[PDB]
Design an enzyme around this catalytic site. Structure first.
Site, PDB file in Angstrom:
ATOM      1  N   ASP A  37     -20.218  -7.181 -16.349  1.00  0.00           N
ATOM      2  CA  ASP A  37     -19.887  -7.355 -17.765  1.00  0.00           C
ATOM      3  C   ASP A  37     -18.453  -6.960 -18.057  1.00  0.00           C
ATOM      4  O   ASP A  37     -17.983  -5.901 -17.543  1.00  0.00           O
ATOM      5  CB  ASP A  37     -20.761  -6.457 -18.656  1.00  0.00           C
ATOM      6  CG  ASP A  37     -22.224  -6.836 -18.715  1.00  0.00           C
ATOM      7  OD1 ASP A  37     -22.568  -7.971 -18.378  1.00  0.00           O
ATOM      8  OD2 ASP A  37     -23.005  -5.967 -19.212  1.00  0.00           O
ATOM      9  N   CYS A 169       9.675 -29.185 -17.129  1.00  0.00           N
ATOM     10  CA  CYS A 169       9.019 -27.938 -17.592  1.00  0.00           C
ATOM     11  C   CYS A 169       9.899 -27.535 -18.807  1.00  0.00           C
ATOM     12  O   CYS A 169       9.362 -27.353 -19.864  1.00  0.00           O
ATOM     13  CB  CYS A 169       8.779 -26.943 -16.442  1.00  0.00           C
ATOM     14  SG  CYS A 169       7.606 -27.483 -15.161  1.00  0.00           S
TER      15      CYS A 169
END
Lengths: 364, 368, 363, 363, 364
Positions: A37, A169
């Site tokens: 978790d 980019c």
């Protein structure tokens, strides 16, 4: 049979699809990715990055980590149909996290804009577009279809407008490996929708063989800068390995031509043929310089090209020094040797080939 | 063995199990209540304000505070049944628990993660299931209607979300379903029904049929880690802490369900060692390692052993968990030098006092 | 003959332009500057300064780091035509980064204004104006031509308005070395456009030879303060070395006159003629006091003046103790001895002379 | 003197008869007043450097200021020549007590933006007692409007509540915080000829039911009126503080419980020379919990006139803390608790809370 | 004269600077520290930059004193060497500019006293600023700050006229004789520049401070006065007294000549067979340099003001050698400064021409 620090044989990795089962160490990697978790990377769709904080991932590299996990999960879905639903779940989370500002926000912090997909920024949005497609090939879900169509049209329109083949980019910063991702994303959109966005690929493959490649070395230059016309005059192994791997899914003959040349240029076989390591550039004996990813991307290229001998040599170099262990059925490395370590070893162990992903049997 | 006191143990298992019959907590349970209540500003139950110094001093991670408060609250409800002279103190501490549980420090991960500004409107059942059970237990212990309007509102949210869903229960955010989180929410409907004469608990049978058909491996007596209804995925690993928590809460609602799977659960996960004196719990299959994952398999199994009346396993587990943590009493207050996990003092307190979830559900009204 | 601890001979550096090739260690420096994603200084035009964070560059020094890299890149363009496009790309990035508020924002933080170019602030905007001009000489690109014209006119108009020759960095703070950059930027603008902004230069060279220089010692005083009339009473070697190097590109005879006097004043030859180090001021035997840059700027001046002996002696002092190494074809120093270390050793190894840059042939 | 004692117990108890503080008390006043910026009583501004230097937790600053103020009120009674200084320091104490650094925990915890409107009696009970003591010492009406306003809030809250007194927050009632608030009503009545103190008898009757163990002479830790809970542990520091302040209003009350309190909590050791105080029942440990049982018992021993126990406690508390006098100012190297110099100062000077109520008007 | 161990120059040499029209080499090296290195020297720029003070760990509340004491030293350099007068004036312009920055005065606002540091009270800050405005104009002849000087002089004049005690508080109920000494001296300087009579208030102030604020037999002032309560803090203070008597000697020489020998008997400890001295901060202690730690350094300034070469020599033999001066590249540094304000007060005492000489400085 297995040297110290190897978990499964090369034969075993290459046989996973024929056995319809991942190896136990690949299952233990999936457990690392999914089990605990809050701190496992694929626990939640939320904008939480504890798994990456724990690994000290630099902010600019999170987008690559998520994408390379996603590409491995697409091959898990092809290997073992019983893990296809899990792989689809994890791909949903990958897409969700990829859209968080922690992942793309460097674009805004560097001064380039408030919207990371509107223009340029093809490393980020090429990966996101390929992820949207692979999610839908694996699951059949139309959850992201409107976003996928929108981003595919942005990429198509930017390629159509440019006088060089592809997208930057940023202004004057062109990277062949970022383009390779964007073009493969067009092949995936065409598989899903019956379109012909991939028709742009031939112009791109002709363009990158012009001034972006050193034909004798089988190696791409680091980058191209369209405003000045400059090509940075150093060849790059990790750039070449990534690009040839993705291109092999679109034009196998292209990568088959350059692959032997690439190996002669960069790959150092050592320890009596048992191991190999990859030099990042020319004019050095040092291995894994620059960003430190030449050997890990060459492991992915060897898998894509079906080269079991080089795959075994590279994994014998990379995995034992990193000290794998399995604790409570989950895989960890004590000494990862690079950025993106567990991501790239996972992807290379499962990779079914980018062409096989394009031809993935449709969802039940 | 139940009347022996091993090194590093503070009271015998016989003593913990006899507290309700004797109408008195053990001295170490009282010393835990002193830790919880005594020192100004830094004790966890000093004030109803949005102050978390006790949790800062223990290095509790933000995402775990909601569980720490809820597990303290569940132990306080049992203290109220053990000793009527402590029931008013337990009620006061429950009021503080509910007040702190509502602070944004506790629930605010929901908003920081991008899921919304309101932690109860939809989904988020681990947070709001615990809050709804806490509202109910506070009112059973005290008779106070302080939180009754909020309790009615949140009970109806949970009822309406169950009724709207095609699977039985509520998620923790889209495609993330946890059986243990749902167990808390269903038990909260049983408590609301005890207080108000309603039948919100009628939903429970469809839920027990769903989790038994689809989310349990019946031969191993073990639940899978999680379910993801949108993809249909079940994460393909069994989880001991998930199973121990869920079987303990289910035993309060359908005792026969938990009695069917409990022996199988023990065979699957529980390792007895040290010539029968100790036990430790593996978190999943295919490993010899104890207490992997979130590290709470042994501590939740200690709670389950108490719920099931299994004195031998309780003794074995506490012999594993407590001595290495080095308990002592200083100025009538309990301390541990080396807590072994998250939620350590909370879960050992809860297991030492736990009266059973069915007994809590049936708690008699307070003396006037 | 390769001296101990050196990467290449002085003969090799001085022959680069005739051979039309940089030395391998200069190429390794260009690799440091360009190669690694995100962290190399010339990776992107964005307002990212990771390379400077990793070197612990103080904020106020970033503007000098960028400018000195730019000046070296302009000489790389002259040395090797095959690296001219790379040098142009790097100069585009240098101009872009120079305009980022991380670089100029000390002007606003100190209370002087929100606009770093409209008045004063000549160290910042002199360097930016020279960089605009060198970028256009190297590339032929008009990308920054309107900004270049605007800033050249600001500099022209401020010189014309002032009763002293030149421009202050703030009220009462005048630096001869900052003015030298601004005047050189007017010569470059005139080369590109056929204008006569450089006509102001003679009044400036006459002015700085009054109270600002000790002519016998060939040395400038640290600073001038026009409101009080003060001249700070210490002579400065790094101030003098920088100023004489840039002046040699505009009035070679000025620097030929003072250079031998400067060397007698400040330069200490040691280790039986093999090494040299530079005192920053008079009345001390200590080398490299003050900002710690006297030896490194004197290395640039020795290159500008064609003085191979002094260049060799200074580089034998500066480079070996800094422990250069080449890893994966990229240059690093383990122990840089000053601020601006890799920038100034790069610039001095390639420097073709400021006059040669002025006369750069078209692309 | 034994090591680490600065003056005899006889000397402290004789200060009022001699009309002079002892030299170590004067050296504490020098610590409090002497050094610019960092002494606690340097300025009336919202600066807390003295408390930063002692690592005082934010929630304890309000207690530190109040306990200093109560000691200053006794200095004013001991030595008429120090009454003006004590008044000046009280003016600063009131000013600093009103700063948000001191009260702002009330707002940070979520209870409100106004620290006096309702509840919060530990903060506002001390502030109300300080307003009164300031005016008894000085005759100044500077804070009279604020004092009247806060006295009426306290009176109206007592009148509205079904239990006797006021909470610190809902369901959190502390007998020691109420003791301060009730004493503040006695001081207001001395100044103004009112009868706000008439509420005291109902309060003394109330706290002798569920809040005290009469056989042990000890108060329970706290009361929680909404649940009815009384926390089931007795507390020495709570009892010592409460009995000391109550002795100023109802001496018979404190005289009834004091011998029992001593039997319950006080340990004499070291051949009768020292004593230390257990915080609760069921322990041999001294000074558990907040760690203030011995220090508040030192104040109680002074209030009750118990010279033997005062001497024994100061022999326990002072020597290990390593006092010294440097430039006529008192320091402790190893203070053993929170509020250490504050509580030792107060116990050394304390004239009795009844004597403060009866303080003669200023000269 | 023999150079005492560890000293840079003889006492005879410091006292001879004005007659020789030259500063000593170590005073020149102090001026180099103050002026030479870009960005980090204290007098590099008029901007609101405090790097020199960050490097010395100067506390925020002490910066105003550092700037003022540098300024007072610079005014004496202007009288010593006509060739350094323009430099001294430049440095004084920077001192005034920096003194006006919020980093310097902002404690007034942070403590809750107001947003305007000169409107009322706050005489330590604004008394020093007013004296600095005046000394700047005496050294340079510049009217740059004349309007601000006139405004602040009128504020100080009006506040003295309104108060029932003689002078101005720092805060309400906090009166400091040394802070008032600066404000009164600033009125003498304004009158020298403008032919005015603001200084007429001085006699009432000198009468007032010789009542409850002084112990006349000990020649020592009490620490502070608090007019609302009437309190005088009952400790005498050496640093308070040394500073006050130094400044008062420029306005009423006979006042300081009366109390100086008494002050010395009260506080000064001669040791090491008459070679050294150190100053107790208060009565009833043998400890030297308690409290703020400045008694010996302010008494070095007072010895210079009073022409006491023997005590100046003794104190400098105590203060300077243990601080380990050195001269590197013609600039002075101390390895182990013994107090706050250390290089500032040794600079000021080495050059100080006397406050009366500054008041009567001949024109540029």
């Amino acid at each position: 049979e297995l040297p110290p620090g190897r978990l499964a044989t090369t034969e075993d990795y290459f046989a996973q699809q024929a056995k319809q089962a991942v190896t136990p160490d690949v299952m233990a990697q999936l457990a690392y990715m999914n089990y605990i978790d809050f701190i496992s990377p694929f626990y939640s769709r939320g904008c939480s990055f504890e798994a990456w904080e724990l690994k000290h991932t630099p902010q600019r590299v999170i987008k690559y980590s998520i994408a390379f996990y996603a590409y491995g999960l697409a091959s898990v879905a092809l290997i073992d149909p019983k893990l296809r639903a899990l792989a689809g779940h994890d791909l949903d989370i990958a897409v969700s996290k990829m859209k968080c500002k922690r992942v793309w926000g460097d674009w805004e912090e560097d001064g380039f804009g408030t919207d990371p997909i509107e223009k340029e920024n093809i490393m980020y949005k090429g990966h996101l577009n390929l992820m949207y497609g692979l999610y839908q090939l694996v699951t059949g879900s139309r959850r992201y279809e409107a976003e996928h169509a929108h981003l595919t049209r942005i990429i198509h329109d930017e390629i159509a407008a440019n006088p060089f083949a592809g997208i930057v980019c940023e202004p004057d910063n062109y990277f062949v490996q970022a383009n390779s991702v964007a073009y493969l994303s067009l092949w995936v959109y065409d598989r899903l929708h019956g379109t012909d966005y991939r028709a742009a690929t031939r112009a791109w493959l002709d363009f990158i063989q012009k001034d972006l490649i050193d034909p004798e070395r089988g190696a791409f230059y680091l980058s191209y800068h369209p405003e000045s016309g400059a090509v940075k005059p150093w060849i790059s192994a990790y750039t070449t390995a990534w690009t040839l791997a993705m291109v092999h899914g679109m034009d196998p003959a292209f990568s088959e031509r350059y692959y032997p040349r690439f190996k002669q240029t960069f790959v150092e076989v050592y320890d009596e043929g048992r191991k190999a390591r990859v030099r990042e550039t020319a004019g050095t004996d040092d291995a894994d310089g620059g960003v430190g990813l030449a050997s890990a991307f060459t492991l992915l290229l060897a898998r894509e090209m079906g080269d079991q001998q080089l795959f075994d040599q590279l994994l014998n170099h990379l995995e034992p020094p990193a000290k794998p262990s399995i604790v409570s059925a989950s895989l960890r490395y004590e000494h990862p040797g690079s950025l993106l370590f567990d991501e790239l070893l996972f992807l290379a162990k499962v990779h079914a080939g980018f062409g096989a992903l394009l031809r993935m049997p449709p969802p039940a």
